[PDB]
Enzyme design. Structure first.
Site, PDB file in Angstrom:
ATOM      1  N   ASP A 166      46.782  39.387  41.164  1.00 30.33           N
ATOM      2  CA  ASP A 166      46.005  40.208  40.268  1.00 30.33           C
ATOM      3  C   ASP A 166      46.955  41.062  39.437  1.00 30.33           C
ATOM      4  O   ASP A 166      48.142  41.124  39.718  1.00 30.33           O
ATOM      5  CB  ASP A 166      45.070  41.069  41.120  1.00 30.33           C
ATOM      6  N   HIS A 302      35.775  33.206  36.024  1.00 25.58           N
ATOM      7  CA  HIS A 302      35.830  34.659  35.892  1.00 25.58           C
ATOM      8  C   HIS A 302      36.654  35.112  34.687  1.00 25.58           C
ATOM      9  O   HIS A 302      36.182  35.922  33.884  1.00 25.58           O
ATOM     10  CB  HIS A 302      36.368  35.259  37.181  1.00 25.58           C
TER      11      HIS A 302
HETATM   12  C1  HEM Z   1      36.010  42.261  43.585  1.00 24.03           C
HETATM   13  C2  HEM Z   1      35.820  42.018  42.277  1.00 24.03           C
HETATM   14  C3  HEM Z   1      36.875  41.368  41.373  1.00 24.03           C
HETATM   15  C4  HEM Z   1      37.839  40.505  41.705  1.00 24.03           C
HETATM   16  C5  HEM Z   1      38.108  39.871  43.087  1.00 24.03           C
HETATM   17  C6  HEM Z   1      38.582  40.184  40.513  1.00 24.03           C
HETATM   18  C7  HEM Z   1      39.664  39.320  40.456  1.00 24.03           C
HETATM   19  C8  HEM Z   1      40.374  38.995  39.316  1.00 24.03           C
HETATM   20  C9  HEM Z   1      41.492  38.090  39.234  1.00 24.03           C
HETATM   21  C10 HEM Z   1      42.075  37.334  40.433  1.00 24.03           C
HETATM   22  C11 HEM Z   1      41.887  38.041  37.964  1.00 24.03           C
HETATM   23  C12 HEM Z   1      43.020  37.196  37.379  1.00 24.03           C
HETATM   24  C13 HEM Z   1      44.350  37.934  37.400  1.00 24.03           C
HETATM   25  C14 HEM Z   1      44.640  38.694  36.143  1.00 24.03           C
HETATM   26  O1  HEM Z   1      44.412  38.191  35.028  1.00 24.03           O
HETATM   27  O2  HEM Z   1      45.125  39.837  36.256  1.00 24.03           O
HETATM   28  C15 HEM Z   1      41.038  38.926  37.193  1.00 24.03           C
HETATM   29  C16 HEM Z   1      41.114  39.183  35.839  1.00 24.03           C
HETATM   30  C17 HEM Z   1      40.267  39.977  35.091  1.00 24.03           C
HETATM   31  N1  HEM Z   1      39.152  40.659  35.545  1.00 24.03           N
HETATM   32 FE1  HEM Z   1      38.413  40.539  37.467  1.00 24.03          FE
HETATM   33  N2  HEM Z   1      38.055  40.906  39.451  1.00 24.03           N
HETATM   34  C18 HEM Z   1      36.994  41.637  39.963  1.00 24.03           C
HETATM   35  C19 HEM Z   1      36.184  42.476  39.230  1.00 24.03           C
HETATM   36  C20 HEM Z   1      36.143  42.597  37.843  1.00 24.03           C
HETATM   37  C21 HEM Z   1      35.114  43.272  37.080  1.00 24.03           C
HETATM   38  C22 HEM Z   1      33.919  44.025  37.676  1.00 24.03           C
HETATM   39  C23 HEM Z   1      35.443  43.119  35.782  1.00 24.03           C
HETATM   40  C24 HEM Z   1      34.718  43.626  34.540  1.00 24.03           C
HETATM   41  C25 HEM Z   1      33.417  43.888  34.535  1.00 24.03           C
HETATM   42  C26 HEM Z   1      36.678  42.376  35.698  1.00 24.03           C
HETATM   43  C27 HEM Z   1      37.389  42.055  34.554  1.00 24.03           C
HETATM   44  C28 HEM Z   1      38.548  41.320  34.495  1.00 24.03           C
HETATM   45  C29 HEM Z   1      39.303  41.090  33.298  1.00 24.03           C
HETATM   46  C30 HEM Z   1      39.056  41.663  31.897  1.00 24.03           C
HETATM   47  C31 HEM Z   1      40.438  40.223  33.695  1.00 24.03           C
HETATM   48  C32 HEM Z   1      41.517  39.707  32.743  1.00 24.03           C
HETATM   49  C33 HEM Z   1      40.981  38.564  31.884  1.00 24.03           C
HETATM   50  C34 HEM Z   1      41.994  38.106  30.864  1.00 24.03           C
HETATM   51  O3  HEM Z   1      42.545  38.939  30.108  1.00 24.03           O
HETATM   52  O4  HEM Z   1      42.267  36.858  30.811  1.00 24.03           O
HETATM   53  N3  HEM Z   1      37.069  42.035  36.980  1.00 24.03           N
HETATM   54  N4  HEM Z   1      40.133  39.507  38.052  1.00 24.03           N
END
Ligand code: HEM
EC number: 1.11.1.19
Length: 446
Positions: A166, A302
């Protein structure tokens, strides 16, 4: 024109300490609270400049943010320009197809006036700082709730509780960051209130702050692991390898960080570790129809939901710069114990663990709230796809407790649908404003 000396460090850099504590407080006797805010907190608030330099990382990094009711408790009646912030997250819950009836009771209301974020390489050092604060503020500060968090151990350092690396992807702030390949580039005012091209007029003292959306998101890790094994696509590798592929299709990255858009059938750990390469994609592939091709990455994955890149227009070759205004800076950190032997063996959660989710943005309606409501929870987002029903985000998508229908995950057939139980359970949170440092000993202490 970005005055980073005056911006709290978690907003643009992150604390990057092993341990963190989120200390949620109420204010009593505000005149006393204000004296200590100025004398005891303001001088030790870590700035972006301070955290950007190794020689000046503090032993305990501290940031502070206030809810609407906290600002009011301090006699600050100004309109900060954000209706969602003013109303509080409990009132926004139904926008996300959840109910506050499931929340930590302290979040299901507006009694919380603020949060102090403390970060250090040991919990003992955090505890010492909390004791100092309670000693000098005395009864003028009151702890209502707290949540401890930690970077995960060993080979999971920097990974969230499901096991995925992450903190890879963040918007680059134009004029401040040196952009990485594929990284979006946005105006500072998308993240920092009153900064370049923030279209919302703010109170003068609030220029240099950001809105902090906090969410306590429980992750059902044994359940997730077992679901992947049970639904693993047929193929030549081990059952676990095929389960891993399904998980990668759900997130949009392998656990190593390698983006599936660039390596759709197998992991590439070297790619995952390389910041110069692991974000260098737009979802477009020459010779494939963007509107229908899910062979590289599902439309419902996601990261594709939360940063659509070419799905929302713009350049087909990196960097794609679409939807800059819907960017968030993330500073989340895992909480709770590691999965115990008995939980893993029974495929059942007993103890609460998850992500202490932190998002910064200048407009809540454009950032966190948008991404949750308009994208993750919306079966028809991104728009313009065939078939049109993308389904929900398998990681964070919500529908009032019901299983989520998610399409496109299976490489063998993009029309195949899965009905997936929630693996992430909201326990609620709050919206705060992280002021510029000058406001802490300034307006907020006046
Ligand atoms: C337990 C809940 C969540 C988990 C396990 C999770 C996990 C992850 C993972 C593994 C990544 C990819 C690694 C990275 O790009 O840094 C990621 C990216 C991202 N997450 Fe989530 N996340 C969670 C909650 C959220 C929520 C609630 C939001 C927004 C409402 C969110 C928004 C984003 C965004 C904006 C990215 C980057 C996308 C990009 O720029 O390509 N995340 N998250």
């Amino acid at each position: 024109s970005l005055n980073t000396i005056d911006i709290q460090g978690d907003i643009l850099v992150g604390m990057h300490k092993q341990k963190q504590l989120f200390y949620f407080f109420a204010i009593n006797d505000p005149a006393t609270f204000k004296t200590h805010l100025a004398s005891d907190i303001a001088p030790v608030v870590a700035s972006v400049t301070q955290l950007s330099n190794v020689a000046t990382q503090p032993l305990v990094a501290l940031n502070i943010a206030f809810s609407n009711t906290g600002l009011l408790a301090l006699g600050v009646t100004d309109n900060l320009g954000d209706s969602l912030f003013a109303n509080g997250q409990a009132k926004d819950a139904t926008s996300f197809k959840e109910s506050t009836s499931s929340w930590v009771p302290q979040f299901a209301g507006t009694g919380i006036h603020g949060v102090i974020i403390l970060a250090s390489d040991t919990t003992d050092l955090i505890d010492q700082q909390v004791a100092s604060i309670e000693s000098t503020f005395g009864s003028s500060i009151s702890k209502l709730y707290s949540l401890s968090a930690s970077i995960r151990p060993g080979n999971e350092a920097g990974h969230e509780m499901f096991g995925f690396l992450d903190g890879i992807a963040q918007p680059a702030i134009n004029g401040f960051n040196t952009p990485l390949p594929g990284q979006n580039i946005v105006d500072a005012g998308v993240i920092i209130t009153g900064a370049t091209n923030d279209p919302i007029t703010r109170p003068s003292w609030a220029v240099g702050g950001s809105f902090l959306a906090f969410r306590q998101l429980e992750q059902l890790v044994p359940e997730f692991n077992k679901y992947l094994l049970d639904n693993a696509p047929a193929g030549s590798g081990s059952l676990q390898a095929r389960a891993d592929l399904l998980g990668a299709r759900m997130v949009g990255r392998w656990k190593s960080g390698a983006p599936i858009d660039l390596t759709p059938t197998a992991d590439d750990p070297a790619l995952g570790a390389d910041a110069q390469r692991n974000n260098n994609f737009t979802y477009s592939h020459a010779g494939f129809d963007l509107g229908s091709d899910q062979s590289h990455c599902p439309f419902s994955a996601h990261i594709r939901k939360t940063r659509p890149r070419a799905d929302l227009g713009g350049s087909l070759t990196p960097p794609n710069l679409s939807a800059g205004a819907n960017s968030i800076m993330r500073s989340g950190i895992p909480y709770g114990p590691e999965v115990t032997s008995a939980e893993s063996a029974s495929n059942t959660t007993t103890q609460e663990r998850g992500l202490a989710f932190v998002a910064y943005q200048a407009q809540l309606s454009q950032g966190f709230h948008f991404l949750q409501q308009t994208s993750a929870d919306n079966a028809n987002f991104p728009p313009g796809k065939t078939p049109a029903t993308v389904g929900l985000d398998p990681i964070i998508g919500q529908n009032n407790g019901q299983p989520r229908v998610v399409n496109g995950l299976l490489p063998s057939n993009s029309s195949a649908s899965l009905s997936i139980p929630q693996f992430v359970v909201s326990h609620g949170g709050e919206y705060f404003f992280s002021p510029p440092i000058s406001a802490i000993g300034g307006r907020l202490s006046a």
